[PDB]
């Protein structure tokens, strides 16, 4: 394999995988690249050829049964493969290359058709195929891969597993019984039920708990369990617990470190605290057993401190709003909300009248907010100044807000959107002055352009 | 019988479908196409709005569409430069995207959809494009990541500045599904694309009460993600969640569900297990919107008789822990209503001053956190609350008889919750 | 991934048996210089102290002389060459060009996509604008669907036009191609014919390729 790669074999499989003439020539030239890519040492040169690119698209294109009909309906490769050529496709299903797991599941599907027609599906059990297809289904994140692996598991009459919900921290006791049944510990279901292991209790299981409490006597069985578990821990969504994406820092050291996320975030370490953790703590608290791993996590931690030092941050504490959106509670609601977003996106602290009440503390905090905000945006919607008309009792909130704004000499910008201009005299004198200000017309279509115009006006 | 009812309806529906398929073989300029599209559209609409057993009829109907020209027919028609035909096909697709038909579209032609999405102008179209998107984001993380990477989220985030009732109802139900189904990676992106800020105009709606309810599940689900929590907060959309949940009535949005044809039985056992991790967040906003939804569902599911869901999901134990340690009226109101509708024993709130508890307050809290098996031993040994805040593993193991080290880990977790709620005014 | 098995065997043939134990802790050749004896013992499972001490000693000599330093791969997203071809006909010759040129160290952009649809004239067009050279497989019927395509719908058409517009180095590869009349092509792409074509020898592939390389920038 090293030599084939050094002789540029991947690069020369390109003209055969990119064939437009034969569909078998591409299928055959794709088992070739997919097998080479399974070799970790030549993986990165096989990738650089850009031949692996073509694998997944193609497996998608084709149909299993049809290349099983180019086999069983043909004289050549009648029974397809035999029990020793089949046990060379099973280590494809178990690579970390999607390209290889797809081409692998395509071939195993085709064979599962043939071998079911005949009646020899016992192969697939001894090869160890069935348990490997039901683990491309459980943890798959690709449609092609799972399509084929489900077709296969059906053709060989097995129970097609359901995909595992990824957010393990959140699992209850029933999601744990399910995952135990899909990784073939269905014998320890009763004891995981008696003790009510849910998913925070599972991501935290120790050898002693496994041994004593769950009754996994064998130390080989425990080693087999903790291997399944380390797969799940690596697939898991930790969005609920991780706040610093420690899971992606741990995975950037080394993909098999991502399994230590929960243990580290359940001690409330984060990226900003890792630089001060000690080896004994990585061992005793966070549960990282391999010293070799402990020492890498640790070393990299002290390099954050050096170059990517997580320094103190700061968020806008300016309680003072920049803009105050005044609007007819019923009519202008829409336009006001839109203004809020646009302006907020352009970095303007916006005060809208979130309150639906328009009551309680009558003209209280809202009025202080006006006095607080440099700019005063006025959604002139249809009927905006209708209840302001001859409201010399200064009861209308819009009224009060306008008056307050005028009184402070605030920058007022009205947003003409349906508004029929009324006669000054129909409004109380204290608010007639609102009409002197130039209104901006809102374009329901050219929202962005309109907004730029509005921003020109603000202070 | 039930089966027969379904069959007999289909015995007319299936033939009728085959006829519209003929009009969909006849390539009119906009004629035989437009008509034919509209024909089958109406034929499936009837089956969806069937007030009897109609879900099953329309399931059968949509299946047959897939097994007879598929969605491929419509997906080609979705490219047809005739606006009318594009529009009529959009309408049809939106209403037939069931599970199996969504798997197909995901494979065969998601790239068609993401090209239709670039067109944002005809509102009759946009309505349905946005509608397709809604059901497509409900597919798988892969499909989500694909609809986000190509501008499919960017379309539902532009149609939030629009005004059409149904368009917006589609746009919010969509960011809903996308946060709920997209995974860690998609959630970060939605937040980075300012999705929280664009749910503001939908949660602050004065026109529709469902549009706000739907735009609030969207923010409340995003805020549950600890990594994007602080940016979701900065939008000021979470502000609106709690006020609104208060406003509304559970039963009434269960009557906008069970008294309606759409979402008849509300949610199924897998859409329900996505509301339970809301009850368990640390966000009040999320625990409220979560308990609102679970209340509405507890009404529906009690009417029917399927309340066994709530036990396996793990809802019941989570509502009786929003009741025990709650410090908010809204939250507890809903969580008590629910626990009643599902005929459980509504717990009493725990008195917070634990140091001062006697032996009876400890027996009560043991019964509410489901250690009611260790009540006798906590009584024999007269654990009161200074003795409880001080329990050690050895005391738990030897003296109380909590043999299992997993049971002790489960106990000390409940205990660490109580210790965090406790009033310590007497000692501190 | 690092052939630790052949480093361990070069110390001493009976060390090769420790490969799996060392690579299941995700040591590799580039990390061995920092491992400790207790870790060789507890993690990697090497029992004989005498062995531990040799593996260890040799490890710290990598650090010295065969120090595994930081590497670097081509991050030049910019392609050097863009292979434009008739999706059905030129496929073969295009693929061949891709390999030959890639072997001679030219970032090659072929139209891997089988679709010729989806995002119509989108990323592919940016790729043209990105790549210094524009190689054109003139296969039989290459410019036939480009003929009077004033609607600029043909991708080949668009690609050529984009290439001309940017003033890209265009090199056509004559392989079956009957030269058409300029007037039969849209004016925006008639200029393609002004460029000297290179004849492809299905036999003398290497020689042909050297000729092609002379032309590239
Ligand atoms: N129809 C044809 O033209 C045809 C048919 C088969 C092979 N051949 C020729 O036959 C020659 C012999 O090579 P081969 O294919 O026998 O080598 P091989 O036995 O090493 O090839 C592996 C074979 O295992 C499979 N297999 C399934 N059940 C089997 C069984 N019971 N016993 C043995 N194999 C079984 C297939 O038959 C497959 O060909 C090849 O050189 C080839 O050119 C041609
Ligand atoms: N009356 C109507 O107009 C109407 C009714 C329902 C859906 N639809 C259309 O139907 C299409 C199909 O989408 P969908 O809603 O079937 O997708 P889906 O099955 O992924 O949606 C989840 C569904 O689970 C719930 N559920 C409760 N019990 C269920 C059961 N026994 N089986 C399945 N689901 C159960 C609800 O029915 C809810 O709709 C949608 O595109 C939509 O436009 C319209």
GROMACS .gro file of C-alpha atoms in nm, chain B residues 4 14 21 49 69 90-91 117 138 156 178 237 243 257 262 280 298 301-302 350 354 360-361 364 371 398 410 426:
model
   28
  463UNK     CA    1  -6.224   0.011   0.607
  473UNK     CA    2  -5.634   0.701  -0.527
  480UNK     CA    3  -5.135   1.248  -1.289
  508UNK     CA    4  -5.900   1.841   0.638
  528UNK     CA    5  -4.401   0.994  -1.051
  549UNK     CA    6  -4.488   2.485  -0.449
  550UNK     CA    7  -4.835   2.481  -0.288
  576UNK     CA    8  -3.556   2.997  -0.207
  597UNK     CA    9  -3.739   1.873   1.053
  615UNK     CA   10  -3.649   3.232   0.630
  637UNK     CA   11  -3.414   2.426   1.272
  696UNK     CA   12  -3.636   3.845   2.257
  702UNK     CA   13  -4.503   3.770   2.975
  716UNK     CA   14  -5.480   2.196   1.786
  721UNK     CA   15  -5.372   2.045   1.161
  739UNK     CA   16  -3.475   2.098   3.269
  757UNK     CA   17  -5.143   1.681   2.850
  760UNK     CA   18  -5.337   1.324   2.537
  761UNK     CA   19  -5.583   1.293   2.828
  809UNK     CA   20  -4.055   2.271   4.954
  813UNK     CA   21  -3.352   2.362   5.508
  819UNK     CA   22  -4.128   1.557   5.882
  820UNK     CA   23  -3.999   1.803   5.624
  823UNK     CA   24  -4.170   1.506   5.256
  830UNK     CA   25  -3.659   0.832   4.729
  857UNK     CA   26  -2.400   0.216   5.633
  869UNK     CA   27  -2.841   0.996   4.231
  885UNK     CA   28  -3.030   3.140   6.014
   0.00000   0.00000   0.00000
